[PDB]
Amino acid sequence: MPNFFIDRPIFAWVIAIIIMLAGGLAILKLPVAQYPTIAPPAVTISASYPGADAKTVQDTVTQVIEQNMNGIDNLMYMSSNSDSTGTVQITLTFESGTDADIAQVQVQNKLQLAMPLLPQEVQQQGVSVEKSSSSFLMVVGVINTDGTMTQEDISDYVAANMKDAISRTSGVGDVQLFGSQYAMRIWMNPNELNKFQLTPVDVITAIKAQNAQVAAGQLGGTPPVKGQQLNASIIAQTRLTSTEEFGKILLKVNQDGSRVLLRDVAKIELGGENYDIIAEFNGQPASGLGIKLATGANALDTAAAIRAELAKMEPFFPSGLKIVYPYDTTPFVKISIHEVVKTLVEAIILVFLVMYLFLQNFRATLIPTIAVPVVLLGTFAVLAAFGFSINTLTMFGMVLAIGLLVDDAIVVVENVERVMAEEGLPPKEATRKSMGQIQGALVGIAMVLSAVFVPMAFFGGSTGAIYRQFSITIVSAMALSVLVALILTPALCATMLKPIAKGDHGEGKKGFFGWFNRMFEKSTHHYTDSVGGILRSTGRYLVLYLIIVVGMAYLFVRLPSSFLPDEDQGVFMTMVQLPAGATQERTQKVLNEVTHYYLTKEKNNVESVFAVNGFGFAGRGQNTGIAFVSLKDWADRPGEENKVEAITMRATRAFSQIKDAMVFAFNLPAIVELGTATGFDFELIDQAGLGHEKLTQARNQLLAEAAKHPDMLTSVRPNGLEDTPQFKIDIDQEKAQALGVSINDINTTLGAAWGGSYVNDFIDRGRVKKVYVMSEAKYRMLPDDIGDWYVRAADGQMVPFSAFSSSRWEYGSPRLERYNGLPSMEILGQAAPGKSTGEAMELMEQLASKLPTGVGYDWTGMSYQERLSGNQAPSLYAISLIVVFLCLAALYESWSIPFSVMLVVPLGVIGALLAATFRGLTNDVYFQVGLLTTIGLSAKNAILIVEFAKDLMDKEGKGLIEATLDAVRMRLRPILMTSLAFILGVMPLVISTGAGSGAQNAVGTGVMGGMVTATVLAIFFVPVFFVVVRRRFS
Amino acid sequence: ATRAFSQIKDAMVFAFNLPAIVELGTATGFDFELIDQAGLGHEKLTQARNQLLAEAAKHPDMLTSVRPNGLEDTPQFKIDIDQEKAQALGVSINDINTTLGAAWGGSYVNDFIDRGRVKKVYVMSEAKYRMLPDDIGDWYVRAADGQMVPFSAFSSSRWEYGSPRLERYNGLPSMEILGQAAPGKSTGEAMELMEQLASKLPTGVGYDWTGMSYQERLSGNQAPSLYAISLIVVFLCLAALYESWSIPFS
Amino acid sequence: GADAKTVQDTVTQVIEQNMNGIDNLMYMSSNSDSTGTVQITLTFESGTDADIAQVQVQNKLQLAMPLLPQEVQQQGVSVEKSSSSFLMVVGVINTDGTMT
Amino acid sequence: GMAYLFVRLPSSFLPDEDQGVFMTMVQLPAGATQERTQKVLNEVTHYYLT
């Protein structure tokens, strides 16, 4: 479709304009995000049995939920953690691309089918069923400047003005608060309960009776007696609202005529709902909002929209309430996308320049200039049309694709140049006969190149997502590039090229330009003589080539393998873990040391330290902590010692010294939860009745036997917690029945007192909150305190617990886990410094087999799936290779003549390969898309020379040894522009220091090394590659 | 119809047509929400509601018929149970509250079968005795000693105020306000003056638009600009067929 | 037998608070009356899925449902997805006088 | 004249139709018994029928 689009110009114009309008508008509407969603989905059921103990919770709640979990379509497995804090969480992981919402309710339907089998007390609290990512998203904290409010204060004002609003927004699939909404707290004193002769039970009962909302009918209610004129509602008792109010509750009335009130035997007080989560902001008190993302949410959308929900809130915020932002995995994405757009521009300028340095008028130079927005614009129009998003992957796809655009453009132009200089032809007729001289060229080129890229969308994992992300960005790029190259570029070559006088290669013109033309044609002649000169020795460079191939395969096996390079995300984190029982104090001492380091010893780089005592990626506990660290701006810390690498390095090096504390500071493993690298994750399943202990032991036997092969396996350690002592209280029941005391009374006062108790609700300034009942602190602090507590026997006599109880110390885990219904213990290790996850896993399996009866093994998460290259990525090459060869046969119509270009491929891999080992770099995803890029590009290079040459053997009938070079000179001018324009445009990435750097670098250098060698080798090898393939056959 | 119904005293009676289709009467003006954005309570939202409602009937030149879509606080009959009296007499607050409710409000007890279908069983004071405040004391609950105590004994009844249709808008207490852009004016301007008037209201009260005024409709926004783009598109196809730059404009 | 505040306290509020992470929701109206009724209505994006949107809501409901009174879920709640005006209203009358 | 004709021209969505059915709302004070309301529905239906 060329000579016609050449006769009609403004029409091609119009097609182009349309395409640009499209891609430009699909920039405006496309989801500008970080990556594609890669998590296999997870739904999560979550319960709470307050005052319970990991086994009471794992028995009573955990198990009766797991068993009622079946016929949930597409489920992968079921993790179940159950802790001494009385929490349970259960998480079902599903097929990737399985439906988030469907998958969600199968689970909740199966839940309420168990739900009536959970205790009273655990669904009074209620369960939850969220569908959500595992890491956060961004965490706004709230602090008071004015001092006019504490931390439980702040916490409440968010959990009564902010959390509810924020949470309601879409894609916002779990909110975790940093402190607690208020609850009315009744702190029962035991000496005084026993004094007026009351149990906790009496308190609890009074509260239910006298803090209640009764419905009491109407006046003149349907059906009324005829002639009733009035219809009023009746209001009875109503909820309570104040501390004072709860104060005056009537516990009893003595014979004396006495009043006993609630505040007569307890501290009434507006308190936090729970008291374990305590936050600080640079060691000032603070609360805030831990925000998770729901499997399928929703880009800079969700989070611009959280500043949306919060815009309306700042208005009514009291005296000193200020937002602070200690964690924004947000403007990261923003300046990554920025740093892509920049390099797109720099490519435009540098190419406009190389363009100018070869084709020395501004018209020729502007031609491929205009041809670039068009094609790049167009591709956002298509990334709306097949589903994808303006993310990192997509953007680097765009920046890669820059080249295989510039090439088709370049040839379209420079071939007309060649045509005119060598003819005197009138520009339009020139390019008419010139585009008909390169049509099948650029076209088949599109065919084979897309043939290299397409079979990488194929296929699986969490890992093939990415490969699709690129494969289609880049194949779209292909067809767009080439169609423009047939519609637009021939046309734009027709209407813009200034007439050339035949032969004139700019000799006697100006100063430098003339010298450039002269020395170039000089060098090209030098070069035709050079290649003809390697044609007289056809068999030497063949052995040299085979050398190259050996070196290639070596370079390739000695080269290690990365997924995605870790980045300085501007934020990072710290975990703290103390022994057990390990009070809240001790933990706060350690969070205090830590934040001391970040604030003193690092002022140049640290921007904030949101730190939370009582919370920590494993579960809750008095002995767990975390710091979300924000880092100073990107420029404000230049150099390696200032980026998360060295920063967290020294951090951790220094924390090392904290005794009685594992403290680690980490970076964010690339994105979200996608750290399904970093080694493995092994599960020990209890596959007979063995019990807890024998699984603990066999766990140790493994853990031991693997620290006894530190040469395929290191750091092999349990991800659990260990058995802290627990305080058993035996109720000799017969004693109780003898004394007249109810096991109801007994167990209930035990629990109410030391564990707390949700009684009923109240209203606090127009919001409903809880009412809790519990022993004031002094009397539930020490074992002897057990006997301090009296329950009333049926005869009216207060019996002390010391009477019927029998207390003693025991052992047992504070975080029971199950894996698929069965008891399990989780085991986290590494393939030893030089070894593969496959081998490490293997020795792990072997060691595990030599373990007692009943114990079985299962792999999960990381090691379940298991990743990339070394499996089938080279075989999907292979199929893309028989595909490439197929299209090659298709265009050449020879069986050998394909191989003339197939042998051109290693010439490119051999330069990338180098570039990687010589950089410290590695074989990552970016490298492999760089690799593909390399090989389909060198295919462009080669295919064009052999096309020209066999077009000479078939149209002129000029035998190979002559035609090859007659065309190799005819292509030496173009092959050079493309390559120079390329290696200079991809300089930005291998250049960019910080801010998406690692990724940028990784994409760049592979393609650069690859290119330097692909050109300066194939430029000699391929005119030999074809003569070899043309002579040995037919 | 409506002209005639006009005359009915003690009765708003209106007769309307069906606003075009289903629920698609997201025209006919606006719908404004007064959100209680601090602890203020019912009353102070009632008051500030009035302050708005008033200040807008004091610009009948961008805004008319500005009125609440709620109902207003009819008197309700509070019954206080002096609980100490009850514990002195031997009567259970369970007994007490339950007889109160059963009697004047009714009570779903359990089911029965009526000609092969399950229906309910309800329990409730026959009409004569739940018709008038004095009737409260007519009602006896049995103390633990076996003595019927009358409600007149432990209760203390008195008249109060409070809305018969509390609304909330997004979790928070709210009052809904329905008005019009004055005969010649636009919903945009009416909404604007509504917002301005609302800003000059006490602390805690916040405003939000919904339904009708949330979205907000058609021409004057982007319908002429989607023309405009259809115009550069039309001109594009025009250049395409003519292959002239002027000749389109013809 | 309830009263607009007993219903708006006891039922309305303990339902609204257990309403989050419902994808695509626009807002939440809540009326609560001296007849002891409550209705709560969630409006969604146009073209959002009727059925999906429907159960996110009911799932979040039963997650509050055990916090409503005995007497209010003895009656039971409902979660319908429905237009606001009617459609057509067939009435039934007796000619014979043989039924009220 | 075109631009003038166009700005002076007001703007409708969909024109209301005689749908063959229509409706009436009644609202009395409070407490306002069932009787009183039925008196008013009685007057109303009296109009529509007579």
Query: Concatenated DSSP letters for A931-990?
Result: HHHHHHHHHHHHHHHHHHHHHHHHHT---HHHHHHHHHHHHHHHHHHHHHHHHHHTHHHH
Cβ neighbour number for residue B121 with a 10 Å cutoff: 10
CB–CB of A84/A53 below 8 Å?
yes
- How far separated are the first and last CA of chain A, in Å rounded? 34
Q: What is the spatial distance between Cα A238 and Cα A211, in angstroms, rounded to a whole number?
A: 7
Gap between the Cα atoms of D45 and D50, Å rounded: 8
Chain B residue closest to D15 (CA)?
B20
Q: What does the alpha-carbon distance between residue A347 and residue A345 come to, in Å, rounded to a whole number?
A: 5
Contact A153, A180 (CB under 8 A): no
Nearest by CB to residue C30, choosing from B18, B74, B167, is B167
The resolution, in angstroms to one decimal, equals 3.3
Minimal-distance CA residue of chain D relative to A234: D31
- A175 contacts C20? CB cut-off 8 A: yes
Q: Tell which phi-psi region holds residue C80, choosing left (phi > 0), alpha (psi between -120 and 50) or beta.
A: beta
Q: Copy the structure tokens of residue A249.
A: 């509750």
The span from the CA of A178 to the CA of B132, in Å, is 53
Q: Which residues contact A152 (CB under 8 A, 6 or more apart)?
A: A179, A180, A182, A271, A272
Phi-psi region of A614 (alpha: psi -120 to 50; beta: other; left: phi over 0): left
Q: How many CA atoms lie within 13 A of B171 on its CB side?
A: 21
Nearest CA in chain D to A230: D31
Distance from the Cα of residue A379 to its chain's centroid: 25
Phi, psi of A631 (to 5 degrees): -110, 155
Pick among D33, D37, D38, D39 to test the A interface (most A CBs inside 10 A) = D33
Distance from CA of B186 to the nearest CA of D (A): 10
Give the chain B residue nearest C30 (alpha carbons): B168
What is the Cα–Cα distance from A461 to A878, expressed in whole angstroms? 19
| Residue A322 bridge partners (DSSP) | A143
Residue A86: closest CA among A45, A52, A128: A52
- Cβ–Cβ < 8 Å for B164, C33: yes
Contact A88, A78 (CB under 8 A): no
Cβ pair A219:B131 closer than 8 A: yes
> In chain B, which residues have their Cβ closer than 8 Å to the Cβ of D21?
18
Task: Determine which of B31, B165, B178 to mutate to test the interface with C (most C C-beta atoms within 10 Å).
Answer: B165
Q: What is the DSSP string of A591-651?
A: HHHHHHHHHSTTTTTEEEEEEEES--TT---TTEEEEEEEE--STTS-SGGGSHHHHHHHH
Burial class (CB in 10 A: 0-12, 13-18, 19+), A445: buried
- H or E element at residue A285: strand A285-292
Is the CB of residue B181 less than 8 Å from the CB of residue B187?
yes
Whether B24 sits inside 8 A of D11 (CB atoms) is no
- SS3 category, A450: helix
Bridge partners (DSSP) of residue A628 are A573, A610
For residues B135 and B127, give the distance between their C-alpha atoms in angstroms, rounded to a whole number.
11
* Residues in C lying within 8 Å of A, measured between beta carbons: 1-7, 9-10, 13-14, 16-25, 28, 34, 36, 52, 55-56, 59, 62-64, 66-67, 71
The structure tokens listed for B17 are 């047509």
Question: Cβ–Cβ of B13/D31 closer than 8 Å?
Answer: no
* Set of chain B residues whose Cβ sits within 8 Å of the Cβ of A220: 131
Q: Give the CA-trace dihedral at C81, C83, C86, C88, to 10 degrees.
A: -80
Residue for token pair 């940028």: A1000
H/E run at residue A18: helix A9-28
The candidate with the shortest Cα–Cα distance to A238, out of A210, A268, A270, A203, is A210
- Please, are residues A751 and A786 in contact by the beta-carbon 8 Å criterion? no
Phi-psi region of A112 (alpha: psi -120 to 50; beta: other; left: phi over 0): beta
Contact A822, A688 (CB under 8 A): no
Q: B131, A214: Cβ pair inside 8 Å?
A: no
Distance separating alpha carbons of residues A321 and A52, to the nearest angstrom:
36
- Which residues sit opposite A663 in a β-bridge? A576
| Surface-to-core class of residue A157, CB atoms within 10 Å of its CB (0-12 exposed, 13-18 middle, 19+ buried) | buried
Cα separation of A392 and A333, whole Å? Answer: 8
User: Between chains, do D15 and B16 touch, taking CB under 8 Å as contact?
Assistant: no
> Strand B205-209 vs strand B155-161: parallel, antiparallel, or unpaired?
unpaired
Distance in angstroms (rounded) separating the CA atoms of residues A289 and A306: 11
Structure tokens at A346: 């720099």
A263 DSSP 8-state letter: G
- Inspect the interface and report whether the beta carbons of B206 and A312 lie closer than 8 Å: yes
Size of interface A-C (CB pairs under 8 A): 84
How close are the terminal C-alpha atoms of chain D, in Å? 52
Q: Report the Cα A489 to chain-centroid distance in Å.
A: 41
The dihedrals phi and psi of D29, each to the nearest 5 degrees, come to -50, -140
Task: Name the nearest CA neighbour of A183 among A776, A781, A773, A779.
Answer: A773
* Nearest CA-CA partner of A127 in C59, C63, C65, C73: C63
Cα–Cα distance for residue pair A151/A177, rounded to 1 Å: 12
SS3 C16: helix
Would you give the DSSP letter of residue A359?
A: S
Calculate ∠ Cα A379-A385-A391, nearest 5°: 60
Please state, as a whole number, how many other Cβ atoms lie within 10 Å of the Cβ of residue A475: 22
Report all structural domains of chain A as residue ranges with CATH numbers, in order of start.
1-37+329-514 (1.20.1640.10), 38-132+813-820 (3.30.70.1430), 133-179+276-328 (3.30.70.1320), 180-275 (3.30.2090.10), 515-568+870-1034 (1.20.1640.10), 569-673 (3.30.70.1430), 674-723+821-869 (3.30.70.1440), 724-812 (3.30.2090.10)
What is the rounded distance in angstroms from the CA atom of residue B152 to the CA atom of residue B158? 12
Q: Which of A232, A210, A236 is nearest to A221 (CA)?
A: A232
> Do you find a cis peptide bond into A974, omega within 30 degrees of 0?
no
Q: What residues pair up with B90 in beta bridges, in sequence order?
A: none
Contact C4 B163 (CB under 8 A): yes
Chain C residues whose CB is inside 8 A of the B169 CB are: 27-30
Using the 8-state DSSP alphabet, how is residue A61 labeled?
A: I
Q: How many CB atoms lie within 10 A of CB A657?
A: 9
Tokens at D5, concatenated: 């004709």
**Which of A226, A227, A230 comes nearest D31 by C-beta?**
A230
Give me the count of residues in chain B: 250
Crossing angle of the two packed helices A925-955 and A906-917, in degrees rounded to 10: 150
Counting other chains too, the contacts that D20-23 makes at CB distance below 8 Å and 24 or more residues apart are D21/B18, D22/B15, D22/B16, D22/B17, D22/B18, D23/B15, D23/B16, D23/B17, D23/B18
Would you give the end-to-end CA distance of chain C in angstroms? 26
B:C CB pairs within 8 Å: 61
**SS3 sequence, A762-806?**
EECCCCEEEEEEEECHHHCCCHHHHHHCEEECCCCCEEEHHHHEE
Q: Do B16 and D22 touch (CB under 8 A)?
A: yes
Residues paired with A271 in a beta bridge: A183
Q: How many CB atoms lie within 10 A of CB A564?
A: 22
A534: three-class secondary structure by DSSP? helix
Say if CB A33 and CB A391 are below 8 A apart: yes
For residue C14, what are its two tokens?
């303990």
Q: Give all strands (DSSP E) within A222-263, no chain letters.
A: 232-235, 250-253, 259-261
Chain A residues within an 8 Å CB radius of D31: 219-220, 230-232
Residue A64 is classified by DSSP as H
Closest by Cβ to B104, choosing from A14, A218, A253: A218
Tokens of A689: 């009745």
Please report residues of A whose CB lies closer than 8 A to that of D33: 220, 224, 228-231
Q: What secondary structure letter does DSSP report for A580?
A: S
Q: Residue B21: its chain D contacts at CB < 8 A?
A: 14
Nearest Cα of chain B lies from the Cα of D23 at a distance, in angstroms, of 5
Q: How far is D47 from chain B (nearest CA, A)?
A: 8
Contact D35 A220 (CB under 8 A): no
CA–CA dist A1030, A1033 (Å, integer) = 6
Pick from B23, B107, B214: CB nearest C85: B23
- Enter the tokens of residue A278: 């305590």
User: Is residue A274 classed as helix, strand or coil in its secondary structure?
Assistant: coil
Q: Please give the Cα distance from A307 to A166 (Å, whole number).
A: 9
D30/B71 touch (CB, cutoff 8 Å), yes or no: yes
CA A730-A125-A50 angle, 5° bins: 30
What pairs with residue B34 in β-bridges? B175, B207
Beta bridge partners of A188: A266, A775
Rg of chain C (C-alpha set): 17
Looking up tokens 């084709």, which residue turns up?
A359
Nearest CA to A588 out of A628, A622, A629 is that of A622
D30, closest residue in chain A (CA to CA):
A231
Going by their DSSP bridges, the two strands B165-169 and B140-142 should be labelled as unpaired
Contact by Cβ (8 Å): A409, A490: no
For B210, the 3-state DSSP assignment is coil
Q: Are strands A571-577 and A321-324 parallel, antiparallel or unpaired?
A: unpaired
> CB neighbours (10 Å) of residue B146?
7
Look-up: residue for tokens 């994405």?
A333
